[PDB]
Design a protein around this ligand. Structure first.
Ligand SMILES: Nc1ncnc2c1ncn2[C@@H]1O[C@H](COP(=O)(O)OP(=O)(O)O)[C@@H](O)[C@H]1O
Ligand SMILES: Nc1ncnc2c1ncn2[C@@H]1O[C@H](COP(=O)(O)OP(=O)(O)O)[C@@H](O)[C@H]1O
Ligand SMILES: Nc1ncnc2c1ncn2[C@@H]1O[C@H](COP(=O)(O)OP(=O)(O)O)[C@@H](O)[C@H]1O
Ligand code: BEF
Ligand code: BEF
Ligand code: BEF
Ligand code: BEF
Ligand code: BEF
Ligand SMILES: [Mg+2]
Ligand SMILES: [Mg+2]
Ligand SMILES: [Mg+2]
Lengths: 100, 528, 76, 378, 517, 137, 200
């Protein structure tokens, strides 16, 4: 991307954090994607681009339910487990090595 | 946020725009690449008129709002910073590349995959050159001086300076030898005062083995010149950073005066105190005083009677060159004088100038000091201000030759050797990288072609000749007949470009490309 | 966000291509449909559509709701 | 009525043109030639202009018959420096002996000004006054020595030559008013009768109960002894040169100078000094430590006669005349002064250049008739 | 796209025009201000009422606002030429411009590359400039002859201006005033003072040096066999540079002490000076009432305030030295003269010194009937003092009145015989433009210039190299025979300073104005 | 060398025309073939239209540049003779003009390109025929 | 990290010790060697100017001699602290505060190099490189306080002089200069590299 903020400073980058920081963004909801992207560039430092692609994508897949007329508290629970399981699975595959 | 006043671009258009914007910046400066080139009058919004064949300088002055151009502005700039001569060309090559890159895109190629293609074909050329290049330092001493010059000259052929290019070249050659050492290979340009004033023609631009500065010589009665003071070791001069005025605190004051008692002592205090300094310098045994800050009416007169020509107020960089030029020490207080910290210069005169009531002064040395002063003159400001940057250009090519004695024969041939070598590896490439390599090498061909276009030769024609000849014989150096003369062969013709620079150039363009291409999304806002 | 510019291809008007327009169409059709998706079925309900003078009409006839509802946009 | 709003009335050309607001560039040129007519002759500023007026018309006419202006320009020079010679050759030279004549000139000069019916005592007024500093062989006589002081009120006739000289300042309102001392000795103190004025960062610190009056009562004397030394040197009338620097005659120093019956008069402008040292025969007094009885004068009378709401100073009985002008409207009080200057300058012309031609148009005509004949011979 | 907000670009055809028009335009402004039969132009600045008439090329160009680069280039070239030689200001722009005019011809209608037009010029210049040196005779030796030579330069460098009238008169003044220095090429040593009234022919050079500012409170209005101490020292409250010296006392009396204490320092310093034995003390600085009283009572005359330049002048006529330390008399060159009398220049007080020790500083008094005439006669003179001031530092001389350039014409027009193809044309063009100088010269006078110059060029063609334009009979007489010499540095400067102009411009193929603020 | 300069330079007007013109055959390119997509134009009058027929998209498109309008006329004539290929005829000029953009860069007079292009075309048509698999009604 | 205008997007340099600007803003430089092998780095923290860069008091004297006296004192007051540094036997004298004209002039005379007003976050990387240890006063300057690298030089990289202490096998902090043909690319490298370093 090539963002020329209202600042006049022209930038070009890929650090998804850096892009989502230059987009200003004021929509409450959509503004959280800016936050979780910043944290990702903290507790880790990389993947910033992706934390949002996913974060978004889930919200996308929640539409069908929310539309068909399902409680959100149920979709929230559903996703809650999904993460728990998915998180453990990564820990379960986290190939620790040293001289392996 | 701020949704309005915010536009977006992305490929279909976008890439065309950018590519074209580059191309267009180019179309302006292409007519300035060559020893047949032409300059461009640029005007500051304040009203300042400049005229210059220098790449960087031109593109810096074009107050332009197109983002891609803004980039080529720096591309020519960065190169000027690192080498000092690329400028005009680095952009040309860059644009050509872009047009080329674009062309492929409308045939189904990925922008980012072309990028990697170019970066590759490039690295190759850099090598096919790094191999064909020649060496100077390691070959001779009188020939190093010559080659080092034969570059400074070639480096000036595209400038108004060209007229007297013999002198301006041998001047740049010298100016650098005298402030950098064969071992460190470091030319610190603080050791070379590039000062210029008006008058005469550009021909009356000499090199000073000391420094200049503007001074009336403290007291009018003072002499105008300064002899080596009978059989002495040249001239000795005071280099002090203490004012010829009664010393004062640096914390407070309030010298409380109870009665006529003390006021009587202050009275005679300042009085002979001026003798305390005027004597002090006489003691160190000097000829002339160069004080950083001014002197009082009294202290001045004394410097007169005591045959002590003076120099009231002399800037930092000023005073400092007078030291390094004359081999002296920058003395703090007055009592810190001494015949051994003085300046052993070789002469001092108050230089006249037409009828200009200014009339500065000079400090010579005869023997190559560790400070040179290229003093440029011209019939009118612009000629000077251009000739100074023209001098600078060469001075840089002389610095690059000590930092890398490697030389490649330009005249466009240097770029033909790549285009030739890079294009060869294309046939072996096949598939997608084939289009890239062909492209990279193809853009390159615009460099010599442009030279032909400006010197009045059919582009396709000179290229086929330059390519054939530099193949039917050896991937050597056969350049364009830019001016005429017998025939090609930059060697005989003495056309030389420092290798170190050429690499940088043929990189800075491909890299810049490699950035632009990766841009597939744009978001500009206004100035709320 | 927000499409803009022109540069080449000087055209006496607007012109969106690809993603941009292709989504616009979908959004359009979507809105015009969603107004009357709450009138579907027995459990569906009618609506009042007031003009400028203040008068109105209440009706579930999807076709008259979409007729009465000023739609400006092709796909709408 | 100037841009500032000040109103003026006069026959002096150079002053009408000057204050007229002429706009065209080559038009402004006329004001400068009239300016120089004032700088050399001092009179005829009106005529010099009117001349260029038709001398230029002469070119308007000749330029029509295609004669290069540079032929007209260069020729006009020769036709002029030939006209001047004719003036001289017909000039009826006089000597400053002839007071009968010099008054006739100054008189026929101002016979075109508002002060025409008063030419009687005005015409010689100029003559005498110029000769009072003229000597004989002084060539250009400076008119700076003829201090004229105009004071509003009365009419034009109320203007006198004043035997001695005319000051321009008030006197004393404050402590003990003197304002008049018969047979007095004056002194031009360039000094300043105020408390201690140390030119360096002075300061009088206090830190004692009794020390109060110490500082006080002490300087109380500082002004006193200075005041005595004045009386002591037999200085009757004092003149302080306006010092904006730091006080002239302290309010206190007046109680003293009041008792001592010494009429003081402050704010004597610096440009006066030189002049006052003549008319008053006085002597400048840098310090007090140089204030001596010889550095004074033989004034027979000094008094601030209040002419009527006006108050003007006088030093009667003692190379400097001093005339006072009056009139009703400020336009007069001012105009007459310049209508006296035209006369005063008339004489200056004879001081530096003897002789005088029969004016009234006659010489103009003569040079015309002469050149007219010589023309046929070209 | 690129650029933006009012930036303007002029490519080839356009740029080239902008340029050519500009220069040609500038030149066609000052063509009338040349030639002994030339005219003046009146101008007026931001004050409106600030007119001025002049024949000084550089003057006009310096003032006249312009937006056109190519023009400013020419303007500026004029100020340069006006510097290093003080003259030729006009002759240069014109010859500069005419060369460009002659070039767009070789371009727009002959199709020759500008670079090749430069190629030719650069050669033509060599040849032209050369023939000058190669024909310039000098009289450095024989100081009694170079006086006659040098006086001619003024004689002719003054024609064209108002002074052309009484040129013979100013001719001497200039000459003499320069010789009275004979050295310093700095003309700030000659002070010009002007005052309205009477003919210009009344102007003079007081070989005794006149000065403004009267002396003393009422001192002797004339000194005798003056012995003057020229000095520049603090004369109103001393303590030179001890700053911070406060006077804390515990009683007004202890102030009263310190007060007279200061006024003592003055009687001290004033004394150390009286010890110099002088009948006149001139100080650059001022001198308040008291330090003056001292002098008025010692007979020593106090003539205060003469700034820096005002002293240096006196210190060159009287032969003294500046000084500011009276810590010991002697070792201080004291100045002297015969009289320091006070004179009056049309309603004004001045000090006519007399018989000074070889005055290497002089005063010229100009007298005109209007401020315009003075201010122009001011520089119209400077245009003389400057050349002469330079010719003493460059004894070489050459004959003008066309001759000079016409010689350089036959030079170039000759070396254009051995040349390549296209280049030759530029070369021929050079001599051509050069020839336009005598043309424009004769033009202003009013003769059939074409016809006259063709006669001139014909003599200089067929030998002679001495004939020139008698702009009066409108014939072509011998210049060396008519005392129309010109500084070699001058003409050489024009032929040079102009060629540079040309090259710098012909080389332009684009112009870019930025968003003016 | 040192010969004929060409003081004049509206060289740019050509490349300018080509680019402002090629941009036309750009918007069209997308609608060529069994994968070509239709355009939707809302006329100045407000009437809406949808189609793959080039000549009709260009016609109703509101093309502004003059040499750009030229494309609509060539597509117009493609309709008047063949009646089909109105899309292709344009896209051809699109890179045939780019062919000049490329050649004009190596300094070949356009009148050499123009006249040559003719011969290269009336030679191409013959190749069409020579390989044409004729049918009967 | 440090960014340098110009150069190839890979002509970037990895300094082993530490590299920093060139805050060296004073007269009398150009003397002082610009290169040492094992110099004795003095990571000093404050001042080195005559009249002091900041802070003051009042000096009131009633004796003419006292005036000239207090003066000679000022000077000696500086020079001492100044030689106090010389005494540490150093070759490189750095300070987060100024090094006045006189000061830098002094070391210049006795081939001792310096730099005033060093970047705060820099001295800390300087310490970690030559293993020095900041010192606020000149008095109790003990030798385990100083530091030494393998090589010091004052480069002219990308037309900008760069003081750099390269080679430091005892460092816990490196510095790296980045290059590029535009202030956008160098910028993207620095961010493209932080994303990597942080993942390593
Ligand atoms: N004398 C010449 N003969 C042949 N080639 C030259 C000659 N002079 C310069 N060149 C070519 O032109 C290039 C320099 O272009 P120039 O207009 O000086 O812009 P820059 O040097 O700023 O890129 C040289 O590197 C070389 O390729
Ligand atoms: N008496 C004369 N007769 C013929 N030419 C003269 C005469 N006097 C000066 N000239 C010519 O006048 C020209 C200079 O004109 P001028 O108006 O003085 O311009 P510049 O500013 O160049 O001095 C020179 O070429 C000189 O040869
Ligand atoms: N079956 C197909 N597979 C590949 N190309 C085809 C096929 N059928 C027709 N086409 C191509 O579609 C192309 C463009 O058609 P269209 O988009 O309708 O524009 P036009 O027909 O006006 O050129 C034709 O040139 C033809 O080559
Ligand atoms: F864009 Be990521 F941080 F690699
Ligand atoms: F034209 Be380049 F800057 F040498
Ligand atoms: F009107 Be004039 F000057 F007497
Ligand atoms: F106009 Be010039 F200076 F004689
Ligand atoms: F699009 Be085509 F004309 F079938
Ligand atoms: Mg170059
Ligand atoms: Mg009258
Ligand atoms: Mg002249």
């Amino acid at each position: 991307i090539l963002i020329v903020t209202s600042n006049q400073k022209t930038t070009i980058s890929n650090d998804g954090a850096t892009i989502l920081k230059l987009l200003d963004v004021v929509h409450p909801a959509a503004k959280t994607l800016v936050d979780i992207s910043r944290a990702q560039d903290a507790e880790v430092g990389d993947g910033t681009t992706s934390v949002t692609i996913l974060a978004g994508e889930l919200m996308k897949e929640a539409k069908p339910f929310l539309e068909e007329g399902i409680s959100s508290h149920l979709i929230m629970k559903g996703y809650r487990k999904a993460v728990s399981l998915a998180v453990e699975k990564i820990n379960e595959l986290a190939v620790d090595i040293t001289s392996e | 946020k701020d949704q309005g006043n915010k536009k977006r671009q992305h490929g279909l258009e976008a890439k065309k725009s950018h590519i074209l914007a580059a191309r267009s910046v180019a179309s302006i400066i292409k007519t300035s690449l060559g020893p047949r080139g032409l300059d461009k009058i640029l005007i500051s919004p304040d009203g300042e008129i400049t005229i210059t064949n220098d790449g960087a300088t031109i593109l810096s002055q074009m107050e332009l709002d197109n983002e891609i151009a803004k980039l080529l502005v720096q591309l020519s700039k960065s190169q000027d910073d690192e080498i000092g001569d690329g400028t005009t060309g680095v952009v040309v090559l860059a644009s050509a590349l872009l047009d080329q890159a674009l062309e492929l895109i409308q045939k189904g190629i990925h922008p980012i995959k072309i990028a990697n293609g170019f970066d590759e074909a490039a690295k190759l050329a850099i090598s096919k050159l790094e191999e064909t290049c020649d060496d100077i330092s390691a070959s001779n001493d009188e020939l190093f001086r010559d080659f080092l010059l034969r570059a400074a000259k070639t480096s000036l052929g595209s400038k108004i300076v060209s007229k007297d290019h013999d002198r301006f070249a041998e001047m740049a050659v010298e100016a650098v030898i005298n402030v950098m050492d064969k071992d460190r290979k470091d030319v610190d340009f603080d050791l070379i005062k590039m000062q210029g004033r008006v008058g005469g023609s550009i021909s009356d631009s000499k090199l000073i083995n000391g420094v200049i500065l503007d001074k009336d010589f403290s007291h009018p009665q003072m002499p105008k010149c300064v002899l080596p003071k009978e059989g002495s070791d040249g001239v000795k001069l005071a280099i002090l950073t203490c004012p010829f005025e009664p010393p004062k605190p640096k914390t407070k004051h309030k010298l409380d005066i109870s009665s006529v008692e003390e006021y009587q002592k202050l009275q005679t205090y300042e009085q002979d105190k001026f003798k305390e300094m005027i004597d002090d310098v006489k003691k160190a045994g000097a000829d002339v005083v160069i004080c950083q800050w001014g002197f009082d009416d009294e202290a001045n007169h004394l410097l007169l009677q005591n045959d002590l020509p003076a120099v009231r107020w002399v800037g930092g960089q000023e005073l400092e060159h007078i030291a390094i030029s004359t081999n002296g020490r920058i003395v703090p207080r007055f009592q810190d004088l001494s015949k051994d910290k003085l300046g052993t210069c070789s002469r001092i005169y108050e230089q006249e100038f037409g009828t200009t009531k200014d009339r500065m002064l000079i400090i010579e040395q005869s023997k190559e000091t560790k400070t040179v002063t290229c003093f440029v003159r011209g019939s009118n400001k612009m000629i000077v201000d251009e000739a100074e940057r023209a001098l600078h250009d060469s001075l840089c090519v002389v610095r690059n030759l000590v930092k890398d004695s490697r030389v490649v024969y330009g005249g466009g041939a240097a770029e033909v050797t790549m285009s030739l070598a890079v294009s060869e590896e294309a046939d072996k490439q096949r598939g997608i990288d084939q289009y890239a390599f062909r492209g990279f090498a193809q853009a390159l061909d615009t460099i010599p072609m442009t030279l032909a276009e400006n010197s009045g030769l059919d582009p396709i024609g000179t290229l086929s000749t330059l390519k054939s000849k530099q193949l039917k014989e050896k991937i050597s150096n056969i350049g364009v007949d830019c001016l005429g003369y017998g025939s090609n062969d930059m060697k005989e013709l003495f056309v030389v470009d420092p290798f170190i620079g050429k690499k940088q150039q043929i990189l800075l363009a491909t890299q810049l490309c490699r950035m632009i291409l990766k841009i597939d999304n744009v978001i500009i806002s206004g100035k709320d | 966000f927000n499409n803009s510019r022109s540069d080449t291809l000087f055209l006496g008007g607007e012109k969106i291509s690809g993603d941009d327009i292709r989504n616009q169409n979908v959004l359009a059709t979507m809105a015009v449909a969603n107004v009357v998706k709450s009138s579907l079925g027995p459990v569906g309900l009618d609506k009042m559509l007031v003009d400028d003078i203040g008068d109105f009409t209440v009706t579930n006839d999807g076709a008259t709701i979409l007729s009465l509802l000023d739609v400006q946009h092709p796909a709408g | 009525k100037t841009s500032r709003g000040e109103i003026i009335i006069s026959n002096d050309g150079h002053t009408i043109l000057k204050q007229m607001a002429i706009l065209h560039p080559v038009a402004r040129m006329l004001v400068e030639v009239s300016a120089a007519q004032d700088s050399e002759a001092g009179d005829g500023t009106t005529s010099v202009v009117i001349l260029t007026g038709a001398l230029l018309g002469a070119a308007e006419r000749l330029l029509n018959k295609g004669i290069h202006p540079t032929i007209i320009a260069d020729s006009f020079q020769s036709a002029a420096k030939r006209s001047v010679d004719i003036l001289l050759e017909m000039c009826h030279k006089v000597s400053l002996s002839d007071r009968e004549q010099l008054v006739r000139a100054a008189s026929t000069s101002l016979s075109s000004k508002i002060v025409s019916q008063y030419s009687s005592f005005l015409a010689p007024l100029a003559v005498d006054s110029v000769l009072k500093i003229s000597d004989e062989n002084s060539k250009n006589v400076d008119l700076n020595d003829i201090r004229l002081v105009k004071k509003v009120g009365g009419t034009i006739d109320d203007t006198e030559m004043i035997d001695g000289v005319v000051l321009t300042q008030t006197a004393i309102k404050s402590a003990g008013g003197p304002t008049r001392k018969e047979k007095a000795k004056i002194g031009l103190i360039q000094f300043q009768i105020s408390p201690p004025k140390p030119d360096t960062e002075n300061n009088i610190i206090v830190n004692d109960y009794r020390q109060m009056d110490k500082i006080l009562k002490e300087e109380r004397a500082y002004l006193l002894n200075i005041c005595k030394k004045i009386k002591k040197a037999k200085c009757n009338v004092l003149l302080i040169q306006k010092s904006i620097l730091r006080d002239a005659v302290n309010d206190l120093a007046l109680h003293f100078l009041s008792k001592l019956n010494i009429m003081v008069v402050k704010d004597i402008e610096r440009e006066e000094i030189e002049f006052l040292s003549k008319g008053l025969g006085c002597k400048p007094i840098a310090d007090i430590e140089l204030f001596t009885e010889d550095r004074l004068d033989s004034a027979d009378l000094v008094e601030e006669i209040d002419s009527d709401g006006s108050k003007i100073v006088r030093v009667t009985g003692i190379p400097t005349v001093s005339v006072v002008i009056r009139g009703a409207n400020n336009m007069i009080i001012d105009e007459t002064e310049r209508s006296l200057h035209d006369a005063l300058c008339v004489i200056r012309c004879l001081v530096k250049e003897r002789g005088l031609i029969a004016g009234g148009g006659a010489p103009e005509i003569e040079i015309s008739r002469r050149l007219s004949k010589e023309a046929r011979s070209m | 796209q690129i650029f933006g907000d009012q930036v303007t670009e002029e490519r080839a055809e356009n740029a080239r025009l902008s340029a050519f028009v500009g220069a040609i335009a500038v030149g066609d402004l000052v063509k009338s201000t040349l030639g002994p039969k030339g005219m003046d132009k009146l101008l007026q600045s931001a004050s409106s009422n600030t007119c001025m008439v002049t024949n000084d090329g550089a003057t006009i160009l310096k003032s006249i606002p312009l937006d056109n680069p190519a023009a400013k280039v020419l303007v500026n070239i004029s100020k340069v030429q006006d510097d290093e030689v003080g003259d030729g200001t006009t002759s240069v722009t014109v010859l500069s411009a005419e060369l460009l005019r002659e070039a767009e011809k070789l371009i727009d209608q002959s199709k020759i590359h500008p670079q090749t037009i430069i190629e030719g010029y650069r050669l033509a210049s060599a040849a032209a400039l050369d023939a000058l040196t190669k024909a310039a005779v000098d009289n450095s030796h024989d100081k009694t002859m170079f006086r006659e030579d040098l006086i001619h330069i003024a004689k002719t460098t003054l024609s064209s201006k108002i002074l052309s009238q009484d040129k013979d008169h100013f001719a001497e003044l200039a000459t003499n005033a320069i010789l009275r220095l004979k050295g310093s090429t700095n003309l700030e040593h000659i002070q010009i003072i002007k005052i309205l009234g009477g003919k210009l022919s009344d102007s003079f050079l007081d070989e005794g040096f006149i000065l403004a500012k009267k002396f003393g409170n009422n001192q002797p209005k004339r000194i005798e066999n003056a012995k003057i101490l020229i000095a520049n020292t603090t004369l109103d409250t001393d303590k030179v540079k001890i700053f911070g010296t406060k006077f804390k006392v515990d009683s007004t009396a202890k102030l009263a002490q310190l007060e007279k204490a200061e006024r003592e320092k003055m009687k001290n310093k004033i004394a150390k000076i009286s010890k110099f034995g002088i009948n006149t003390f001139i100080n650059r600085q001022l001198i308040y009432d008291y330090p003056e009283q001292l002098f008025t009572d010692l007979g020593i005359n106090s003539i205060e305030h003469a700034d820096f330049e005002g002293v240096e002048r006196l210190a060159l006529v009287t032969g003294g030295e500046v000084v500011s330390t009276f810590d010991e008399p002697s070792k201080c060159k004291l100045g002297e003269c015969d009289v320091i009398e006070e004179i009056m220049l049309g309603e004004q007080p001045f000090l006519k010194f007399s018989g000074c020790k070889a005055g290497e500083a002089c005063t010229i008094v100009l007298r005109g009937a209007t401020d315009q005439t003075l201010d122009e006669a001011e520089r119209s003179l400077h245009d003389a003092l400057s050349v002469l001031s330079q010719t003493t530092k460059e004894t070489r001389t050459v004959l003008g009145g066309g001759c000079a350039e016409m010689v350089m014409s036959k030079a170039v027009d000759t070396e254009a015989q051995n040349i390549d193809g296209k280049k030759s044309l530029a070369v021929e063009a050079f001599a051509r433009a050069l020839r336009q100088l005598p043309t424009i010269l004769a033009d202003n006078a009013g003769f059939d210039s074409s016809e006259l110059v063709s006669k001139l060029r014909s003599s200089i063609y067929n030998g002679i190299s001495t004939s020139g334009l008698d702009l009066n009979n409108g014939t072509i007489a011998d210049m060396r025979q008519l005392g129309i010499v010109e500084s070699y540095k001058l003409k050489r400067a024009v032929v040079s300073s102009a060629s540079e102009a040309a090259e710098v411009l012909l080389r332009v193929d684009n112009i870019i104005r930025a968003r003016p603020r | 060398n040192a010969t004929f300069k060409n003081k004049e330079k509206p060289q740019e007007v050509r490349k300018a025309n080509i680019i402002a013109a090629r941009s036309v055959a750009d918007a069209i390119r997308t609608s060529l073939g069994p994968k070509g997509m239709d355009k939707m134009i809302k006329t100045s009058r407000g009437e809406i239209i949808i189609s793959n027929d080039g000549h009709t998209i260009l016609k109703q498109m509101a093309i502004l540049h003059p040499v750009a309008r030229m494309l609509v006329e060539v597509s117009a004539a493609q309709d008047s003779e063949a009646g089909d290929g109105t899309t292709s005829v344009v896209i051809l000029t699109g890179a045939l003009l780019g062919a000049a953009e490329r050649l004009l860069n190596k300094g070949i007079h356009p009148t050499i390109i123009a006249d040559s292009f003719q011969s290269a075309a009336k030679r191409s048509v013959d190749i069409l025929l020579e390989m044409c698999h004729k049918v009967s009604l | 990290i440090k960014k340098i205008p110009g150069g190839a997007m890979e002509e970037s340099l990895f300094i082993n010790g530490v590299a920093f600007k060139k805050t060296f803003s004073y007269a009398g430089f150009e003397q002082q060697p610009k290169k040492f092998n094992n110099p004795k780095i003095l990571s000093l923290n404050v001042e080195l100017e005559l009249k002091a860069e900041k802070d003051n008091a009042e000096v009131r004297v009633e004796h003419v001699e006292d005036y000239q006296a207090i003066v000679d004192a000022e000077w000696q007051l500086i020079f001492e602290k100044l030689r106090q540094v010389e005494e540490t036997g150093a070759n490189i004298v750095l300070s987060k505060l100024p090094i006045g004209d006189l000061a830098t002039q002094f070391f210049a005379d006795r081939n001792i190099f310096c730099a005033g007003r060093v970047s705060a976050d820099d001295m800390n990387r300087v310490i970690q490189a030559v293993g020095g240890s900041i010192q606020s006063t000149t008095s109790d300057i003990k030798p385990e306080h100083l530091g030494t690298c393998a090589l010091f030089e004052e480069m002219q990289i990308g037309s900008e002089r760069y003081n750099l202490f390269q080679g430091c096998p005892q460092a816990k902090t490196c510095t790296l200069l980045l290059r590029g043909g535009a202030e956008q690319v160098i910028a993207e490298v620095e961010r493209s590299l932080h994303d990597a370093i942080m993942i390593v």
